Amino acid sequence: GRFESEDLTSIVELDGLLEINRMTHKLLSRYLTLDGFDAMFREANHNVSAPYGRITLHVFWELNYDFLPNYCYNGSTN
Amino acid sequence: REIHQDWANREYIEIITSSIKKIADFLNSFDMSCRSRLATLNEKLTALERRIEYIEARVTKG
């Protein structure tokens, strides 16, 4: 949800937070039993029962609305 | 003499009581051990039940 409420530049933040959550799951799985992180991630992304999740939908929405008509490219720096 | 007979009879009681106590102590320990094994068995069973449900939802069509 936090990613869905910001621009496309929050992708790095989402990946970092996801890595933290995965590590916490690994630490907790040492003493407890829990569902696989992939299953929980798919559950939160609404991807288990649907071909596409929320992250891809937001990326498409951001590309159509903000990124494309508000960014200028520079081939020298890519 | 009666005193010697009483000592022997009380020894019979003492050993029997000790045997009874040992059985009870084992019974309590066995109950605790089986319950622990039972609890961990339930933990795996519920995890399997959740996993199969997730798989069924992932594969179900419609």
SS3 B9: helix
Nearest to A58 by CA among A14, A26, A27, A19: A14
Is B51 in CB contact (< 8 Å) with chain A? yes
Residues 6+ apart with CB under 8 A from A62: A7, A8
CA distance A55 to A3: 8
Question: Min CA distance, B57 vs chain A (Å)?
Answer: 7
Q: Which two tokens stand for residue A38?
A: 């992939």
Q: What is the DSSP letter of A34?
A: -
Deposited experimental method:
cryo-EM
Distance CA A24, CA A30 (A): 10
- The closest CB to that of B57, out of A33, A35, A49, belongs to A49
Q: Is A39 helix (H, G, I), strand (E, B) or coil?
A: helix
User: With helix as H, strand as E and coil as C, how does B16-51 read?
Assistant: HHHHHHHHHHHHHHHHHHHHHHHHHHHHHHHHHHHH
Question: Is B57 in the A-facing interface, judged by CB distances under 8 Å?
Answer: yes
Judge: B44–A33 Cβ closer than 8 Å, yes or no: yes
The full set of domain ranges for chain B reads: 1-59
* Cβ-proximal residues to A70 (8 Å cutoff; 6+ apart), any chain: none
